[PDB]
Design a binder for this molecule. Structure first.
Ligand SMILES: Nc1ncnc2c1ncn2[C@@H]1O[C@H](COP(=O)(O)OP(=O)(O)OP(=O)(O)O)[C@@H](O)[C@H]1O
Lengths: 42, 386, 29, 819, 51
């Protein structure tokens, strides 16, 4: 199937001196198989 | 197409290591991060012309248009000396081609297909100023008058171009700074480039002369052509005495070429329109009077050696950043009646700092300054005059 | 009567005499 | 590689440290005392190479181990002090204080200055890195600060003391220990810092410096810091707690220049005089007098400004009216309207008459009597256009003067009612601009009801929102906030898409200007509007709140909003945002300009059109080529919106300058665009602004020292720029009167000197470019008009002015100590 | 090759008669100036200098 596309993520914000201060302030896996009479088998 | 200016960050006023300066620099860095993030984000966010390109020659060349003819034919220089009677495609703008333009030609048929207006010689592009020296007028001690005349010649005609108009007086378009070896001639140009909004253009007389045929005159043409395309502009020619010495009858071919380039320069100094020119010179007598004729070089600023007051001001300017010792007294060094340029004073300060470092002391002193003065200067008999 | 600087001498010259924000200032510049 | 004496001293120190290491346990004290003597004797010397420290650097670990393993007692600290002083040179895990704490705790002056400086730096580091806990551990690190601050004060390290205290975040000992000579350094230090420091430290530093000024009774400076603070309470307190009347008069001059008006009781020495001064009733007479000096009392006509002779259908008449009003603003006399303005108004047609008449008030600015006399005749016309224009003229006339009588109130509340038609926008806007700073609950309660009455179309609603917001600018008034919120909620879901809805969030943010958590709450409440308009309102309120704060994180958020692709009203608003946040501190202005250039480069037309408005706001009435050439370059842009915005930005940045090389550029632009009528109108408006008041006024919302942000001027500039955010519909159309919002910001650039009688004192003065202090002397005789960026200083010591911020109306004391 | 790799002023090879940039040569260094660079340090030492 088509792998859609990748959205353009905004790059990481800018680390500044006061940013730190602001932040501080705030399975079953079956083991059998059935095949109808038309039997495509490797 | 307007000026080009020179990108420069703001100036942090405090020269001392303090929190004012630290926060100012932090804010500068914050805004730089903002610029980078905005860029990254934007460039992450983001038939007929194809046949135009196909018709256009794949490795199309760049030539010069000459003596346009007809509405569909023109003479073009191949940029190797030869020229051709080429045709013009309808693709080009038309009503825009003028002699001297850097047109684009199909490689094989040699047919005009583009105009490439922004074609600039790499030499001109590199000699154009992009950064800006961080030497504001505040760094120039003394030379107050010289600063006044240079501002009146290259600054007032832009900030207040009404005074000249009020009395019908044309601005001086040429200023030659002549003086002994080192007095601030290049400093004044540095400060003008820093503080001016005009496109600055550094050049040295020894740069305009190229070897192959008439590339010297062609380069002068290109330089002043770009200085006209951008406006206002200031062209600073340092040590013009490289080209401009007394014109003399040539006995060879290289000398004839040099005189031809100098004549081409003089010719380009008759293309008014607002492109100021600042010549610099150590020895002005050797310059040809034609250049110093009072119609192409309007102002001559003499940069004399500094007096006692000027030397004092220079010393404070160049010692402001130095942890001066209280014992020092900045009068004996100055008023000793000996030749001392501003460059000599900077050398004195640097050598004094080095002497203090050698003595292992971070604070300069009077003995350090005296030793520096003794060891920096290199070069009347005693008693004959008293 | 002239000496040559030592590694410890120059290290002391760098560190001892400086305002506390010199390294940060240089880093930001 | 070591001298003989150097090696001998090395041997001595090595023997001493070996003795310390040896478990003698009986001769440690003499060796420790000898080491202390040597180390301090070397340190106190000016040499920058303490030899004991250099020599004992390698044995740092051994000394630490000996100190750890030696018996506790006096010797413990008596060696810990040495260990700390040695660790000063080599560190990396914050050990000097760790060892000093358990130390002799002796006076911090025997150990030279570098030890004190390192102590200050490291204690600042500790205080910065410590959390709210360990308060017991923060207690010891206060006596050392108390000892250090006087040390720095005495030794001229005032900047170091102020820094250390800032990093400590408890700026108390500073103002405790400041002396007389220390203001010229510490006060300026704090004032410079406040611009870059963020809140709440901004307010903390402002109040600290205000207390410092009060300590030695620097009343005008304390009042300037109070004005910096957005609270008209400490201003009243400082004005009241004063004993001299001349200083109170100067403080009243500066208060009137500012938008604050204080309603006191009849108890002050000269209540009538002080209130008259604060109202600036004499402002018109003073402006006329300054006109008489350097005689410019000659109105000029639109053709005179145009200068078309060298080198009339529908829009050029309006442009001529606008430029005539701009050039003759506040001068009273006009040569086209005052002589016979009736014919001018009639030859004006369509909606033009509104602004054509309001130009009469613009000309008769600050002159109530003259405005009334020249407007009464036109006040009664068959067409309501002329009546509403006259109401605007009266409102403009009343604007700028805080007369206790309210002729504007009476006349304009007479018409505030729609009168069976929507043509009351003029009355509402006039009332607003007239009472900008009044904040009278009377006008608030007159305006709010008419704002929602089931008949106030969005035009009226926006006009009254602007009016009430600029009446209560920066006050967080609950009534206004709640009514605006309710109206925004209940207006509609579709009509909001149409323009003129841009003004309600403007009212909100402008009322909540410079507040912060208030706008956080108002946004939390306003998150339920809609998809298109909600982001617009959020961003607009946010910028109108943090205007001038220089909040890097917020302008980063706005930059992200700009960058995100919208395929863009909020995107355009965010550009003016960035401009408004950066509109204060000087350093960030140039970086804002760089951002504007990069946006104009990598930007869609939506924000490309907004960028010129940002340029104009960041450099209003400060015409510099750095911006003017960019605006000129982008004037010829293909986008008509961008061209119009760039031309009007040129006009604003050149406002009140009469600048040559800008008038010429405008003339060339008009010559090129003669065939474009809208662009011709724009360039004519640019010329009108450039010649505004014939070079006697400025739109700069910064008066004191480019540092005091004038709330009313900011209000006017922002409302005008938001109106232009969509030039095509709002202004290039029916509602062109929005230009008149400039009155809130228009302010004369004068320097009038007075004695202690409110009487002029002609005295020579020196003016020139600030150096941060004066360069390029251009001395003249007061009064003298001052250009943007130029400061004035008295040429002689003949007087004793009441302000170090000499500008505007200044009282001069004839009390030189010695002449 | 990439445009951000052929940022100005860098020697680049071009295919013959087609002039198709296909390499990033090392920055230009003029011959007769390249050889003006000590590649084999002389054998002198400060120990060979007296006084
Ligand atoms: N007036 C001055 N103020 C400050 N520094 C000065 C001054 N004059 C000279 N200097 C110092 O000298 C140098 C500036 O001299 P500059 O290069 O302008 O001289 P010049 O006239 O071009 O010299 P030359 O003829 O040798 O080329 C810098 O080191 C500057 O520090």
């Amino acid at each position: 199937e088509v792998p859609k596309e990748k959205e353009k993520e905004k790059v990481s914000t800018a680390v500044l001196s006061i940013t730190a201060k602001a932040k501080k302030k705030e399975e079953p896996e079956p083991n059998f198989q059935l095949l109808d009479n038309p039997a495509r088998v490797m | 197409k307007g000026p080009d200016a020179a990108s420069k960050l703001p100036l942090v006023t405090p020269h001392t290591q303090c929190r004012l300066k630290l926060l100012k620099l932090e804010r500068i860095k914050d805004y730089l991060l903002m610029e980078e993030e905005f860029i990254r984000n934007q460039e992450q966010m983001k038939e007929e012309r194809s046949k135009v390109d196909d018709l256009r020659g794949t490795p199309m060349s760049v030539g010069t248009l000459e003596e346009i003819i007809d509405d569909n034919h023109a003479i073009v220089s191949t940029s190797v000396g030869s020229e051709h009677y080429v045709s013009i495609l309808s693709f080009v703008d038309k009503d825009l081609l003028e002699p001297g333009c850097s047109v684009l030609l199909n490689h094989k048929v040699h047919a005009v297909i583009g105009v490439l207006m922004d074609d600039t010689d790499p030499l001109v592009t590199v000699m154009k100023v992009e950064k800006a020296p961080q030497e504001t007028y505040a760094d120039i001690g003394g030379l107050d008058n010289q600063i006044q005349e240079i501002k009146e010649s290259v600054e007032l005609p832009l900030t207040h171009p009404e005074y000249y108009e009020e009395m019908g007086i044309k601005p001086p378009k040429g200023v030659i700074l002549y003086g002994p070896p080192g007095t601030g001639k290049t400093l004044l140009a540095k400060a003008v480039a820093n503080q001016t909004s005009a496109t600055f253009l550094r050049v040295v007389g020894s740069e305009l002369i190229q070897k192959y045929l008439g590339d010297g005159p062609k380069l002068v043409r290109e330089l002043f052509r770009v200085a006209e395309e951008h406006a206002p502009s200031i062209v600073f020619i340092d040590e013009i005495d490289a080209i401009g010495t007394k014109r003399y009858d040539s006995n060879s071919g290289g000398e004839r070429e040099i005189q031809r380039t100098m004549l081409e320069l003089l010719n380009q100094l008759d293309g008014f329109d607002d492109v100021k020119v600042i010549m610099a010179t150590n020895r002005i007598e050797t310059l040809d009077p034609a250049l110093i004729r009072p119609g192409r070089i309007d102002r001559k600023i003499e940069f004399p050696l500094p007096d006692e007051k000027t030397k004092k001001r220079i010393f404070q300017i160049h010692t402001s950043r130095m942890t001066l010792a209280d014992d020092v007294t900045l009068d004996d060094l100055i008023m000793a009646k000996d030749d001392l340029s501003g460059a000599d004073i900077k050398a004195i300060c640097t050598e004094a700092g080095l002497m203090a470092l050698r003595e292992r002391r971070m604070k300069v002193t009077n003995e350090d300054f005296k030793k520096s003065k003794e060891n920096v200067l290199y070069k009347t008999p005693e008693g004959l005059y008293l | 009567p002239i000496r040559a600087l030592d590694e410890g001498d120059i290290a002391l010259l760098k560190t001892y005499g400086q305002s506390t924000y010199s390294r940060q200032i240089k880093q930001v510049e | 590689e070591l001298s003989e004496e150097d090696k001998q001293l090395q041997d001595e120190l090595e023997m001493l440290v070996e003795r310390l290491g040896e478990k003698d346990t009986s001769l440690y004290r003499p060796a420790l005392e000898e080491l202390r003597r040597q180390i301090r004797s070397s340190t106190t010397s000016m040499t920058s190479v303490p030899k004991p420290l250099k020599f004992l650097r390698p044995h740092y670990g051994k000394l630490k181990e000996i100190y750890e393993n030696m018996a506790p007692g006096e010797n413990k600290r008596f060696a810990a002090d040495i260990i700390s002083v040695l660790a000063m040179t080599m560190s990396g895990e914050r050990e000097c204080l760790k060892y000093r704490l358990v130390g002799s705790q002796e006076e911090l002056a025997s150990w030279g200055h570098e030890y004190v400086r390192h102590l200050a730096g490291e204690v600042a580091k500790e205080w910065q890195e410590l959390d709210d806990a360990e308060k017991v551990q923060r207690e010891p690190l206060l006596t050392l600060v108390k000892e250090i601050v006087p040390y720095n004060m005495a030794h001229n390290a005032e900047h170091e003391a102020c820094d250390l205290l800032m990093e400590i975040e408890q700026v108390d000992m500073l103002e405790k220990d400041i002396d007389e000579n220390a203001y010229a350094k510490v006060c300026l230090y704090l004032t410079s810092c406040v611009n870059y420091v963020p809140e709440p430290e901004n307010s903390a530093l402002l109040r600290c410096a205000l207390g410092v000024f009060r300590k030695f009774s620097r009343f005008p400076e304390a009042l300037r810091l109070a004005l910096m603070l957005n609270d008209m309470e400490l201003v009243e307190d400082i004005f009241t707690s004063c004993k001299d009347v001349v200083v109170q008069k100067q403080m009243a001059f500066m208060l009137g220049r500012h938008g604050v008006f204080l309603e006191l009781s009849e108890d002050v020495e000269e209540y009538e005089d002080l209130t008259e001064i604060m109202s600036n009733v004499q402002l018109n007479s003073n402006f006329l007098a300054l006109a008489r000096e350097l005689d410019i009392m000659e109105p000029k006509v639109p053709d005179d400004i145009y200068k078309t002779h060298l080198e009339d259908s529908a829009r050029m008449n309006l442009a001529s009216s606008f430029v005539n009003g701009f050039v003759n603003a506040a001068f009273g006399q006009d040569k086209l309207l005052t002589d016979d303005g009736n014919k001018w108004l009639y030859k004006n047609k369509d909606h033009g008459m509104l602004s054509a008449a309001a130009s009469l008030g613009m000309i008769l600015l600050w002159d109530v009597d003259g405005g009334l006399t020249q407007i009464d005749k036109y006040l009664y016309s068959s067409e309501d256009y002329i009546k509403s224009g006259a109401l605007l003229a009266c409102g403009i006339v009343n604007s700028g003067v805080r007369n206790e009588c309210d002729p504007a109130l009476a006349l304009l509340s007479d018409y505030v009612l729609h009168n069976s038609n929507t043509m009351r926008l003029g009355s509402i806007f006039g009332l607003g601009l007239a009472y900008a700073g009044s904040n009278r609950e009377d006008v608030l309660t007159l305006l709010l009801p008419v704002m929602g009455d089931s008949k106030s179309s969005m035009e009226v609603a926006g006009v009254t929102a602007l009016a009430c917001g600029m009446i209560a600018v920066g006050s967080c008034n609950g009534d206004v906030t709640s009514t605006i919120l309710q109206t925004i909620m209940e207006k509609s879901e579709t009509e909001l898409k149409d323009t003129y809805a841009r003004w309600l969030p403007l009212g909100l943010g402008l009322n909540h200007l410079g507040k912060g958590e208030a706008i956080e709450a108002i946004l939390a409440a306003l998150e339920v509007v809609s998809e298109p308009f909600r982001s617009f309102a959020n961003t607009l309120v946010d910028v109108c709140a943090y205007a001038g704060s220089g909040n890097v994180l917020k302008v980063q958020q706005l930059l992200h909003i700009c960058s995100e692709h919208f395929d863009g009203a909020h995107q355009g608003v965010a550009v003016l945002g960035i401009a408004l946040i950066a509109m204060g501190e000087e350093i960030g202005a140039e970086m804002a300009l760089r951002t504007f250039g990069h946006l104009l480069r990598y930007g869609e037309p939506t924000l490309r059109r907004a960028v010129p408005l940002a340029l104009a706001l960041i450099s209003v009435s400060n015409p510099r080529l750095n911006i003017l050439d960019t605006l000129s370059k982008f004037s010829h842009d293909a986008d008509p919106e961008v061209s119009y915005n760039s031309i009007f930005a040129m006009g604003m940045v050149g406002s009140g300058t009469n600048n040559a090389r800008l008038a010429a550029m405008l003339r060339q632009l008009a010559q090129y665009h003669a065939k474009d009528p809208n662009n011709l109108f724009m360039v004519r408006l640019a010329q009108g602004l450039t010649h505004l008041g014939k070079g006697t006024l400025t739109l700069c919302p910064y008066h004191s020292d480019r540092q005091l942000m004038s709330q009313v001027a900011v209000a006017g500039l922002l409302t005008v720029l938001v109106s232009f955010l969509d030039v095509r519909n709002i202004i290039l159309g029916k509602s062109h009167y929005v230009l008149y919002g400039l009155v809130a910001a228009m302010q004369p650039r004068m320097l009038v000197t007075f004695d202690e009688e409110l009487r002029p004192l002609p005295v020579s003065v020196r003016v020139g470019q600030a150096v941060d202090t004066i360069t390029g002397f251009q001395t003249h005789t007061t009064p003298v008009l001052l250009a943007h960026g130029e400061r004035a200083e008295l040429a002689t010591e003949e007087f004793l002015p009441v302000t170090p911020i000499l500008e505007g109306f200044v009282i001069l004391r004839k009390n030189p100590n010695y002449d | 090759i990439d445009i951000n790799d052929v940022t100005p002023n860098c020697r680049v090879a071009l295919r013959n008669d087609s002039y198709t940039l296909h390499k990033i040569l090392p920055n230009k260094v003029d011959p007769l100036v390249s050889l003006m660079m000590v590649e084999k340090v002389p054998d002198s030492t400060y120990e060979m200098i007296g006084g």
